[model samples]
Target chain A: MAPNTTEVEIISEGDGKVFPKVGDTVTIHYTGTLENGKKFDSSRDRGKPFQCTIGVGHVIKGWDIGIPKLSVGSQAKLTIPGHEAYGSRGFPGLIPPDATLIFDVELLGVN
Target chain B: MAPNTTEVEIISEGDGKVFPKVGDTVTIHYTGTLENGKKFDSSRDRGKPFQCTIGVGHVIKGWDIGIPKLSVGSQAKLTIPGHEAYGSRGFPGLIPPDATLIFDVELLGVN
Candidate 1:
């Protein structure tokens, strides 16, 4: 279970009633950091939400699993294991090998 | 009218009055093909609109130009030269070297 498991913590549930389906495109703002609290990427800094189609391989596996569970405007924290993220071959110079990632995520819109 | 230039053709304009700014997120559906008409990627086939931040380098340079000019629900065709796309180091097997690209795109939502 540890290999593929992603721990999700709901921060603020959104007001929107509709949850995104597999083919729906979801928009979100996120802050990605290392387990040691070192920040790497952030949508807020860019002043835009990261957008992608859900349930597809367009994003990391943890995002595919964690984002769908939230409604529009919801905020959550995702503790993604290495296998659920970049795996052993982590992003060189960006992410180290076997590194677990932490993502502070906000679901903005689902189309 | 060649290098760094992207030829844009309006297909259908959207109903929304507001256009996206540089820091805004835009949702779109697109089909990308080479000059030979061989399809490389598509959002429609995936049953979702592709999403990204406008005016940022999150996507190809052509998209950075094309998607921002559109309002929500608008559609257009973008003809991108090699340099504005994958350029000389084109995606092997997917796009040949110095390949020009054509994208039929629809702007679905803007946030």
Candidate 2:
């Protein structure tokens, strides 16, 4: 059988923007939470934007799947299954096993 | 006896500017390594600017000490003793116990 990709959902569509190109750098603000609303990471708390280049393997797979769909200045809420985020080997003391995650993200800019 | 703070060194000082306030946020790019130049973290590889609030314990002590000394658009290299970094209970795989560290950092902005 094929892998279970249906477990993930796009809670909301971004501004219908395409994903960033491989070498493009994008800036965003994000808050990642568990199903129980336990926040694991948040750029909002920092009061500044987080930036990253696409297709550099610098981040995990969820961003790979999600960033391309964001338009500059768009806001998105994404729900991701474990396999697409941290995979089976979760980060100890942080992410739990087979957990689901939600992200409130803003696509601030793309360079 | 006094606490041993002298084990650390300031490889370079940033351009003279007052430290950001406790509640202020700053953006930076950094490359972190051990004495042997084994890189543990680097924003350059991610092609991203890392953002954090100045206080509120967002970062380890090394950054707490160093970030304050930087001006906007300044760059510096810091060598920090282990106690100021990950401490004894290091991150299981990424960091080790009692490891001294070095960082080449850029101060991009503050808000």
Q: What is the DockQ of each candidate?
A: 0.02, 0.03
- Per-candidate RMSD vs. true structure? 17.7, 16.0
Error of 1 at A94 (Å): 1.4
Q: In model 2, which runs have C-alpha deviations exceeding 4 angstroms?
A: A1-111, B1-3, B6-18
* Cα lDDT of model 1 by residue, B1-111, tens digit: 334678888888788686878878888888999988999878788787766667866567788887778877888999999888766545423566567899999988889
Name the regions of candidate 1 deviating beyond 4 angstroms: A1-4, B1-111
Report the poorest 10 consecutive residues by lDDT, candidate 1 chain B: B88-97
lDDT values of the candidates? Answer: 0.78, 0.68
Write model 1 residue lDDT over A23-101, tens digit each, in one string.
7888889999998998777878888777777886556778888888888888999999988776654542346666799
TM-score of 1: 0.50
Looking at model 1, residue B26 earns an lDDT score of 83
TM-score of chain A of each: 0.93, 0.81
Residue A106, model 1: lDDT of 91
Q: After superposition, how far is residue A33 of candidate 1 from its true place, in Å?
A: 0.5
Could you give candidate 2's per-residue lDDT for residues B1-111 as a string of tens digits? 212441333344555664577768888888888788888778788788877776655567767776777777677777777787666534324566667778888888889
